[model samples]
Target: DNAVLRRRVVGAILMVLLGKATTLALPFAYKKAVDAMTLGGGAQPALTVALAFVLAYALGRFSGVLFDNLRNIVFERVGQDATRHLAENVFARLHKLSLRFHLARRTGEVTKVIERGTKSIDTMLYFLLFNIAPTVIELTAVIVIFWLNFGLGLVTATILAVIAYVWTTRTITEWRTHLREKMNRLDGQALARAVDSLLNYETVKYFGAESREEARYASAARAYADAAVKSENSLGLLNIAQALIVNLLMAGAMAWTVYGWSQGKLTVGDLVFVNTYLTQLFRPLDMLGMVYRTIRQGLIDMAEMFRLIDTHIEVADVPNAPALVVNRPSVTFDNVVFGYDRDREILHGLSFEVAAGSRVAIVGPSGAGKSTIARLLFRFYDPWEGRILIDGQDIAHVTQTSLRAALGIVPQDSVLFNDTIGYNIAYGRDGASRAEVDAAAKGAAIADFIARLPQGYDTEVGERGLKLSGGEKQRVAIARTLVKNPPILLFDEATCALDTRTEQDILSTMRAVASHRTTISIAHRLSTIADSDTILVLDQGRLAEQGSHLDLLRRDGLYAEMWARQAAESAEV
Candidate 1:
């Protein structure tokens, strides 16, 4: 699947090999000039050598350009494809993961990891080729040349390798551990504090906590800065150590070459060649150390991203599972035992069924697990110890995609994207015509207001679609669900955000939409779901009463008690 990365790496290797070969041959051409001089050739020999040198240099320059350009192009394409694929994968995987995974995680932390992870991979590729591969070639070439001339060259080369292997390994390992730990701590604290402040911005201002908030933000900034500075300082120290080792090798190699010349065993050309080789070797060697350290750090950054890519959600489709196909079918929760956590079960062996095309209103006191039923139907999480059936088929045995595609949910708090009104409504299914979108908007009772906007459907909603009023936002959300046109509808306190008149309008629209489908409504005001075909009153996740609204009120049980409380509150208001 990641064959693109392999291609990019191969292309880089080819480019680097081509560049080094062309440049490495330049020194040989210079040696040829020395050979021509020693043989006492014609006066034109120097001219001939100059011409050869110029030609080699020109060819090297041309090849370098070709290789570098090709390498960069391949890398750019590879990086774009890989990161886009990575982000897409993360999104799909997030959908499959458990609700607890989401409840315990922060959006900011996940976003930061992905952003940093992709950039780190880019930097890793650059360092791998331009820095790492060239140094490897230099080391090999130096060792070979020294062996042919001095026998002691291999000894010095071994020392160099050992020092690098040990020093770099120790330094990078320690640095990687410390940096990742700090990054984790910083991410958790910074995102949590920032989100808390942002969501409570109005409350903070209302209470005149501006100075206090400013100081809190400053502390968070200082914490991040201190961690970053520490990482940079560690890198600096490691680089200094590597530089010292390289300098010593350079000095030792040159001194030994001079000693050979004094003994009359080395020619001027030989001395010049060895020094030049040392020059070629150290630049890349030092660069290799720096890049190697960076690559290790990059790997640390990618660990979480890689794990996310590889980890599968525990509850998913059974192999070759069937799709939900009935036009309108009943949903049943049979002896359903469930909880967010295992020990404290909320819904204890609860059993219920709603007939096809019936509007079922689940009335319950607080802690009744009514919302849990909606979440279960959405397949957000698997139940702990019972079966939930849609169309008499176990939800766990059905394909997750097939099951979810048949359902539409309008949560208590509508979540809208920061895009045009049209895009937000259609979302992934943007194939709907303008008329269809507007029709859904009309049904949701926000069509007239949207038409008056400065750009109509093209107007941006701002962040989280904050430009619209609460009622308008809810209407748009309803329009989005209506466009999907799923067979099963779930409304969880959806009308609570709207004013009385708008709520009435939306309530009527909800009824119209519910006519041909199975609808489950969770109501805070019992008056809204009074006429539902079936009513179930939940007390601490158990079925306390089940029947029509009038029948439940006559029983004077939990449902009737809730009805009485709301009636009294309405009278008081």
Candidate 2:
């Protein structure tokens, strides 16, 4: 619920108006109390009236405070709900966006944008509903009262002073905004560098570049510090100018009142009334500069978050697209030509098919568009030309969620959440019972290893599962995929990261799992897929040969050469 549309805002609005009424009544009551006391001693009527006014003044003050608090209580829900919805929407949208978008943007910067924007929602609402609106209302009422009590001269001077105060605050804050923006930029850069360095901590340590990273972070921090100092110094200048304007108005108005009293045209009560009203008006006025600056900065933060929301999805499904129906779960790429950018194509008119309930292995050199196939099948990107189909249905016409649900992949490098091992495995099947998790772990041949740990499945996996070895991570990934039990399976060098023994063991587990499913394996090690039903060798971006492992070796093609080289290298090792 938003502040504008929800009924709570209506209640809050009523409370605001009620608070204003009580606040305005307080000064009048104070003036009445003063005038009654000044009537003279032994005046019972004046004394009684004075006592009554005193009570009224106290009651009005109490009521104003009560209503302000109640208004905040009513509006709090609106602000919280708006922030929650916006944060959730941005999070979901980021997941929906293409891989290219995520790759291009810095994770630290994106997270900072979200954090600032969500936090600003409440502050912006407070400024708009409580600070700015109330200030304008109080100023307007104060001006009218001054005009009626004194004359046009006092009212005109007050109005001009307010205009000048607002102008100066705006101009100075605008200049300060540039400095603050620079500070935020440097702050974001520092955060990004820190996050990037931490993510690659191993790389940094391997190269002995810890000092280098510290030096870079220090530079960004120093730049931000300089910008922050300038911003803070400018704030002092703004506050001084604001105080000068308010005090000058106060002095001029009080002088006029004192002059009237000296001429016997006004009571002491009149002077007190003018002073009380001006003091009340200055309360909100004092916060005007900060309120304006905060609101402006909030708008800027929201704009950055909105930019993420507005980013185009590179491979969005058509409107009302139906969920994918996986009868056979067969996949086909027909004459596909695609590239991450227009400058260079990774797959050129590549075509292939994996029959339902069959095992096919794709072998190729590094960067020969091997992993790209897995990405394409998962609908991470759409080919520039040609179409991908699953079970005679075009995947582009199906919802991405359903498409991904039908396919499970164990990538070369299995990145795990920095959480309990049990939680990472349970992520595959939502609401899966412990028994089901154990069964999947056993199926993937990791159950014994997990059982050996002191904490067993509850043991925490360090970031990206660094606590475990490469083979361990792969086995966990396999367990996760087994838990999903998708009809179509992809192994993108799933065993490439393991040692020879572990590789053979994982390959056996994978083959057993893929027996009844449509399986496609992208392999770099030839010995792993020697017994596949079919092996396709990729040359550059084209399919150079396709046959059983024995057939390819007999033909002495690309696959044969790669196999012989690998065999000789293995013997030497």
Candidate 3:
């Protein structure tokens, strides 16, 4: 790729030189054509002659156009590939970043930053090559021509005028950049509000807060409008002042030519040639204001993206980390301590073990660290004080991809990608055979339902699988997990969203899937995990009791108390 990219770059630069060389001669052709016709002298110092000069003028201009566009054609792939390569690396890094980085940033805002940053790369590259560099090249060439032909005074005056023009442009544009910065902030804010509202459309309906959301977005948009108007209005002053300075230079140069002609020191044709060269040089300078502003903006966006890349990864695999080996997925948590905040602890020196092929149920009240334990086991966050092991190998010492591969979870919500049903089921394993997908669906009790749809496996599920009923979504989650077929399975209150009948059906299916795997069910309802091989009751992040159902009842401890309370509630229902 580098070899090909280098070739393209060299070719593009060659085209630039050719184009500029042709363009530099265009002013000479205009001079000759005007002198051939004696149109500007008004004193008849020259004769009407050489119609070929006029033809050459047109042909020369056309060549400039040809070379400029040819360069763009050769350079386009290098620009696009540069942006694509950077964007891919950033996207991969974002996934590798710990959840802590994401919790502080909104997806919509992050997306907007990435979009602006990537887009700026191509535009910045274009301006640097065609606008900024060409301006320098043409300015230097113009100065040399002035010195050799017009003499030292004119070149000195021209240099001072250019300095003044750049100084004024920079002063005014800095103010405008400030306004533009504010506009970008409001724009990203408005965009984030709109995305959040749309994604949570159901939540808005449930609360009847549609108007509230709309007002929030509209308010942000109004701020964006005000800042944009300020930025645009600032341009009027910049443009007016720039025009004044340029026209002054143009008038002074023309006056110099007229004085020279009166003294018989210069020809009548010299004025037009000088004017043409000056105009050509100023053309890209006119764009200088915009080019400068945009480059600054591009730098700011690029820095924002770099900041994201530089964010610390809270959880990372150690050096030389090996893949997790899973002959028997026995899990051990040794004196693990973790908390979302430093001041308050969740799992306080907690310890647990699950033997290979064992079915373990953890029942507890809300905030008793039941869900926290699941996250710890999955290594979403490393424990503060202890170790987690699978088959005698520390999970933290393994590659995260392999560790996650050896474990699977069917969560309560079972979020799905917006894709076809077959794609969602097959997403569990890349390159899964169609027969394997079909078999997993059958085992999850979703195959018959999928067959009833007109598109069957090809049917498109709506965002997050909202098109499916609650129970059906759970079945798909089961199918997805079955396709994964990990040795350790986690049911994190998986069936709580469904009614009793659906829950029973899901439980039966779950039992089938749990047969050969080490299954850990974190349950809210005592009834759901009553027949588990062992029940571990958690109270305040400590193991309160551990025994079979009958043993726990006879112990008359926390589990018995929880069971009795749930039984009374069920009787009332």
Cα lDDT computed for each candidate against the true fold: 0.77, 0.83, 0.82
List residue ranges in candidate 2 displaced over 4 A: 1-11, 28-30, 33-38, 45-67, 70-78, 260-264, 499-502, 570-573
lDDT of 2 by residue, 95-122 (tens): 7788888778887777777787788876
Relative to the true structure, candidate 1 has a C-alpha RMSD (angstroms) of 3.6
Arranged by lDDT with the best first, the candidates are 2, 3, 1
- Alpha-carbon shift of residue 141 in model 2 (angstroms): 1.9
Instruction: Give lDDT tens digits, candidate 1, residues 131-184.
Output: 666766766665675677669755677566657756775766586568656956
* Candidate 1: stretches off by over 4 Å: 1-14, 29-70, 73-75, 129-134, 152-168, 263-267, 309-314, 428-430, 451-454, 569-573
The local lDDT score (0 to 100) that residue 364 gets in candidate 3 is: 83
Cα error of candidate 3 at position 269, Å: 1.5
Query: How well does each candidate superpose onto the true structure, as a TM-score?
Result: 0.87, 0.91, 0.91
Least well predicted 10-residue stretch by lDDT in candidate 2: 263-272
Regions of candidate 3 where Cα sits further than 4 Å from its true position = 1-4, 30-50, 261-264, 498-502, 569-573
Q: CA shift at 432, candidate 3, in angstroms? A: 1.6
Residue 334 in model 3: lDDT:
88
